[PDB]
């Protein structure tokens, strides 16, 4: 019970109201394995998409709940969204958290899943920290309740207890769709324009491999891959269900930090959620020969289709078999600014 | 003389119930707008 009194006194600048949370250790195992993170608040809207200011959230792991029903970490969700009077709530409304120790993993959370659980729960001098004074006397079991989490079908534990007028005005709040809809269809729009760029690049060229990366290939490659077997290039667009782990937007945010590359890897036909957004280096003295070795090891991955994005406005597709199809990247800077504001600061 | 006002606060409870049952009435209409 430390991070709640940490962030409660901290975020008084950009947030009127602060909600406190638990996060179980099973619910973020598919987010980041091996306990690699240890945050940043940016709650986007449902139909009032735009852009909003960011707020920092502090947290801790490895410290156990008073409930022995599950044993996990500490988080907390700021709420600052409602204009003027905070009595209205935005329904069907995402609130993004960027839990991190060094920006890996995201945390999408709802206002219904938060507040329905919240209602379900309920010669001079030094001045004292005022808000910590009421948490020590509570120490009770009814303050924490189990909430069916909507993004991942699991339990997310909230903590709240009858503090004061900020949390007292919270439990009376109600009000009279499209917050998970917009980001996915926006990903499919940029994926369709990139696949259209690949279509027109294969059309204006002879529909032929230039083979930018060198591999040796067997003579039965037109047999063990069938004729025109682009069924993986076909269902590429459904397979990109993630984007901000995907390397495609990673090059656009990398414009603020010249010879850099990011690589997505998707398997040959559904071997699993392989990886998204790995790094090809040119800065350290491993050098361009090490970049070439990693690149040809990328190209010899005979069961994974790779997509290459550059920083300068160019896209590339790597067929397994060393074949490369060139492509453009040129997107409207409104979506660019929307992406870099969705992650961080312009 | 000793049974005059308790009937009236009974009707006041019926009035608060017939008022606050509207909060039950409009939520499934909100569901019909939503889902």
């Amino acid at each position: 019970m430390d991070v709640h009194i940490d962030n409660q006194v901290l975020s008084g600048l950009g947030t009127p109201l602060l909600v406190h949370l638990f996060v179980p250790d099973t619910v973020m195992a598919e987010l980041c394995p091996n306990r690699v993170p240890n945050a940043w608040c940016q709650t986007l809207f449902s139909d009032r998409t735009g852009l909003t200011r960011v707020c920092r959230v502090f947290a801790a792991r490895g410290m156990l709940p008073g409930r022995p029903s599950h044993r996990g970490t500490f988080t907390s969700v700021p709420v600052y969204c409602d204009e003027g009077l905070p009595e209205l709530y935005n329904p069907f409304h995402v609130a993004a958290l960027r839990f991190y120790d060094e920006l890996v993993g995201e945390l999408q959370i709802y206002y219904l899943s938060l507040f329905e659980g919240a209602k379900r729960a309920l010669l001079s001098r030094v001045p004292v920290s005022f808000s910590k004074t009421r948490r020590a006397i509570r120490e009770s079991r009814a303050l924490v309740r189990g909430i069916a989490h909507i993004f991942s079908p699991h339990a997310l534990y909230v903590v709240t207890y009858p503090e004061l007028s900020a949390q007292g005005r919270l439990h009376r709040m109600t009000a009279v769709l499209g917050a998970p809809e917009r980001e996915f269809r926006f990903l499919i729009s940029v994926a369709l324009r990139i696949s259209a760029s690949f279509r027109e690049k294969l059309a204006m060229q002879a529909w032929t491999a230039q083979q930018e990366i060198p591999v040796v290939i067997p003579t039965s490659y037109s047999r063990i891959y069938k004729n025109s077997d682009l069924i993986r290039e076909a269902f590429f667009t459904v397979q990109t269900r993630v984007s901000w782990e995907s390397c495609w937007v990673k090059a656009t945010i990398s414009n603020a930090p010249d010879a850099c590359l990011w690589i997505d890897s998707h398997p040959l036909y559904e071997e699993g959620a392989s990886a998204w957004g790995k790094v090809i280096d040119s800065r350290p003295p491993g050098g361009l020969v090490g970049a070439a070795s990693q690149l040809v090891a990328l190209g010899t991955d005979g069961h994974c289709v790779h997509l290459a994005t550059t920083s300068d406005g160019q896209a590339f597709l790597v067929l397994p078999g060393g074949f490369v199809i060139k492509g453009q990247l040129a997107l409207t800077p409104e979506e660019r600014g929307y992406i870099l504001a969705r992650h961080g600061i312009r | 003389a000793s049974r005059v006002l308790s009937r009236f606060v009974s009707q006041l409870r019926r009035k608060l119930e017939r008022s606050t049952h509207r909060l039950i009435a409009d939520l499934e209409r909100l569901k019909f707008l939503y889902l």
């Binding site: 219904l112 899943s113 329905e116 209602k119 379900r120 909430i147 079908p153 | 608060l16 889902l35």
Partner: peptide, 30 residues
């Protein structure tokens, strides 16, 4: 979205169950 709205109606229904048990306070002295 269908399974998401399934989870959403599931968490929305407990709101009206809590509001029913909140309305039941007036029953308890009547």
């Amino acid at each position: 979205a269908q399974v998401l709205k399934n989870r959403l109606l599931r968490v929305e229904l407990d709101g009206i169950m809590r509001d029913h048990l909140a309305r039941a306070e007036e029953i308890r002295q009547d």
